[PDB]
Design a protein around this ligand. Structure first.
Ligand code: HEC
Ligand SMILES: [Cu+2]
Lengths: 99, 250
């Protein structure tokens, strides 16, 4: 479940970009290079209701430093879909397959 | 981002003299560059680039929320000039450069430097430490006047590497006609129904969150008509300077 945004030189892509977890696990998004890599869950592929701002990031909390990480504690069972805000049309996106 | 141009443009200077960031960073905003009038061989000098902007400016972050601006830059120096090594960097200029990482555009282009995205309120002015070459040490460098080009950006771009627009641009109607319905989205965004009565066709224009439309139901819209305001508060600028590589004699 450890996702490290950015490769080791300039690879903007979630690594991994698709993992499976359960209710009680913790997701992590450590950004290395190509910041900022703040991710935000959208309300288009969410299973239960809940607000997107509850599992997404805000405008003041951005991952621009090489070391900050965004952890999201999910408990609902379903497949979510988060993506790099500063790179949604780029191609680096991941999804939480909690069940 | 500076990595978008590096990954898809071999050299960031176009034939018309346009810097490649102007392909996705379509707003024009002023850029400034201060460099010494002349420098000696094997000496460190500073290239100061200014990417000025109104500080109370809030842009549309890629999630609909409003936020601060980020700055980036591309410095194109002549062949021979390169980033000054850390041992030649004085401590009075070490605190000046903050803690930025200047990267080379490509590993073989040591004369093209890129930096960004860096925080706007912190690095509106960037100092690049350059090392001037030595002619008696490189037979292609000579004492003469050389051009220096800079590209400066502040703000999110409007076009992605695949040609997709981002939510930091205007949304235009894909067809003329009358708006039959405007579906306000639950988590933000809109679905606009256009009745092209001219071609007897119905089209659905989707608008992202962070944007406010200037259109009402029952309104006649033309093709390409702007559907929402332009939320872009940033811009790209280009600058030029000339440096004199001076002979230590006369
Ligand atoms: C199209 C392929 C682009 C090229 C070439 C360059 N940039 Fe870019 N940049 C582009 C987009 C669509 C975005 C927004 C990404 C997002 O979703 O947020 C950006 C963003 C930047 C930023 C950060 C802006 C901010 O957070 O406020 C900077 C500083 C930036 N870009 C600089 C920059 C420079 C100097 C470039 C030329 C080397 C450059 N970009 C090229 C799209 C594109
Ligand atoms: Cu990113």
């Amino acid at each position: 479940v450890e996702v490290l945004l950015g490769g080791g030189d300039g690879s903007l892509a979630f690594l991994p970009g698709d993992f499976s977890v359960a209710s009680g696990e913790e997701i992590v998004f450590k950004n290395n290079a190509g910041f900022p890599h703040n991710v935000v869950f959208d309300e288009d592929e969410i299973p239960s209701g809940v607000d997107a701002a509850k599992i997404s990031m805000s405008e003041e909390d951005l991952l621009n430093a090489p070391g900050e990480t965004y952890k999201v504690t999910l408990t609902e069972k379903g497949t979510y879909k988060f993506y790099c805000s500063p790179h949604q049309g780029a191609g680096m996106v991941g999804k939480v397959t909690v069940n | 981002y500076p990595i978008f141009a590096q990954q898809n443009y071999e050299n960031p200077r176009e034939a018309t003299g346009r810097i490649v960031c102007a392909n996705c960073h379509l707003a024009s905003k002023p850029v400034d560059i201060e460099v010494p009038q002349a420098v000696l061989p094997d000496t460190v000098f500073e290239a100061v680039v200014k990417i000025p902007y109104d500080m109370q400016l809030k842009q549309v972050l890629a999630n609909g929320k409003k936020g601060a601006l980020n700055v980036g830059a591309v410095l194109i120096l002549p062949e021979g000039f390169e980033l000054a090594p850390p041992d030649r960097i004085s401590p009075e200029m070490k605190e000046k450069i903050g803690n930025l990482s200047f990267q080379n555009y490509r590993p073989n282009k040591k004369n093209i430097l890129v930096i960004g995205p860096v925080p706007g309120q912190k690095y509106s002015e960037i100092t690049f430490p350059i090392l001037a070459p030595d002619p008696a040490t490189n037979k292609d460098v000579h004492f003469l006047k050389y051009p220096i080009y800079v590209g400066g950006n502040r703000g999110r771009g409007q076009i992605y590497p695949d040609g997709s627009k981002s939510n930091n641009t205007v949304y235009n109607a894909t067809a003329g006609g009358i708006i039959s319905k405007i579906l306000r989205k639950e988590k933000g965004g809109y679905e606009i129904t256009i009745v092209d009565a001219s071609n007897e066709r119905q089209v659905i224009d989707i608008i992202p969150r962070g944007l406010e439309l200037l259109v009402s139901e029952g309104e006649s819209i033309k093709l390409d008509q702007p559907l929402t305001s332009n939320p872009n508060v940033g811009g790209f600028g280009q600058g030029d300077a000339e440096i004199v590589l001076q002979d230590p004699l006369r």
